[PDB]
Design the sequence.
């Protein structure tokens, strides 16, 4: 299979390849309950007349709840569902330096504190 | 207005707010030629019956070419166009710790070397 | 690739992964002649409407014979074929303690002397 | 009748023969509530034209729940059902040493820690 | 992934595994432009009633052309396409010495000067 | 007629032209028994509307067995058959340097130790 190690700061999470296919790669996190966990869908294809390409990356994670600790009968039930898809449209005949600069800019925008505030406090991006 | 500073590694790019509106925020990068540059579209809304929300983030950048350096007449013409949209469906009554963990996982997946290889070498994600 | 070590008592056998696929994992034992050896087929899937799961495990081993030691001319020919399939239907929302107890009971029933007699002497299980 | 003693580590469970028949042997565990307990189905037959044989072994155990301890009225109700069947296709004219080696290999694969992890953590077998 | 190093005499080319699948392995050479490069397709299967096997090996390489050095606008365009497929039908119960002798004969026929002349000067093989 | 000398390392084999024809050249090895020996089929043609060409090269060798050394009476009988065909699709208006580089790369891939292991041990190519 295929293992992916993610560092959150104090613990390390492990995602395992489940559904190995070319047009659809499904990675699932193995921690405890398999239902309602962390899943990742990856897809790669072409477009038009062999011009550019298309990459899709989605990450889902549904929270679960359980009442067997106090209530005398309740199966683990999912609550909400979060969907975070992507879309990469990069042509083949491009530039390695330009692609590296774009990746660095995306990494900086992700690691900046403005997107974190936009996600947490729901405040529009504008600092 | 609203300025956004992005660090690519050796230089700093500046994006300026251009179309300040609630349902559509348009940021445009100011470097030289305004046509065919870096643009960012942000949108925030609700859904259904005041249950969750919907956030959309798109980033476009079209390359330009010019022949006035050698050829004696050619206006700056755009070449290809890249579209990278997003979709955030996070409910209000959620969990701050869960949202922070999801953001950290997304940042780790973005900063990992697998997505960079998938973007550059067009190799399906699976290491 | 993926290696599996099995201890028979005095020697150790090694099975190697050959056909790495999600819906069908084929492990083959590497000792000498690849044709007519030990093979293992593993499969994992879902069922109905995301309720439970389905696991299938089959183990085959066909004996071979050869006459090149005495007779002039005879290629290694397979004789009989043995099929030992399985079927695991365990729901996701279950109990870890119950699953561990069931696995321990299955291990005890396998390691008991009654199933060995049923296999060897073909005597019905009932001691 | 016919009693079977199984050692779990700290306690001993007793299974009693209930439905004594040649083509179908039904063993049932006697602990408390007979409904929703441990049952075992054994079957032995032939195949084709008196060539080989066919042995089937299934083990079922359904969990039960009750609310009479707190709620003032609820009969013991079954929850989920687990099915673990088998299939033995061993020809008569075989080899005692080969059968013993196969049984030892099966016992080792059952007692190994990989199948336990595959059962508990639902991680595919591959260490 | 999987890297393959090929020595042409003065430089070394590197082919990288792209599409890892059992029934179809796609290797792609990484030098510059990914479109119109060196690709290799490998396939392995069985035949009939588990008698022999079937191996297919194809190698493609399409030349590209570009006019951006002089003409002020022309994307890299492919020209011709070359297809060199193979077919290996070797039974399992064969002979290692015979297979080695056949491989040595094939290597000698490939390295001989007659096939090179047949490829270059298009002269029928017959020296 | 047309003789081809192949060096295996310690001995030299001689193949003789037998069926001299334009659309089908059949070379046969002359050592002893003509039936069940080494044969080579060569074919050259065009394609479409005078664009490129098509070259086909197949090499067959069937092993033989005989029992007249011990058994009273048994004619030389063929056992298995091996087929190794080729396909060359090279356009006329190409490049001599590119063709030479491709031939050198093919010779290196043939003489490498990875294809030898793939042929002998039946291990997929990937070192």
Sequence:
């Amino acid at each position: 299979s295929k293992t992916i190690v993610l560092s959150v700061g104090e613990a390390t999470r492990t995602l395992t390849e489940i559904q190995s296919t070319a047009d659809r790669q499904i990675f699932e996190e193995k921690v405890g309950p398999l239902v309602g966990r962390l899943r990742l869908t990856a897809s790669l294809r072409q477009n038009g007349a062999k011009t550019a390409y298309r990459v899709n990356l989605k990450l889902d994670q549904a929270d679960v709840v359980d009442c067997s600790t106090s209530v005398c009968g309740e199966l683990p039930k999912v609550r909400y569902t979060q969907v975070w898809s992507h879309d990469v449209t990069i042509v083949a005949n491009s530039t390695e330096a330009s692609r590296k600069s774009l990746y660095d800019l995306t990494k900086s925008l992700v690691a900046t504190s403005q997107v974190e505030d936009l996600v947490v406090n729901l405040v529009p991006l504008g600092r």
Summary: Residues 1-127 of chain A form a domain with the MS2 Viral Coat Protein fold (CATH 3.30.380.10). Chain A has one domain: 1-127.
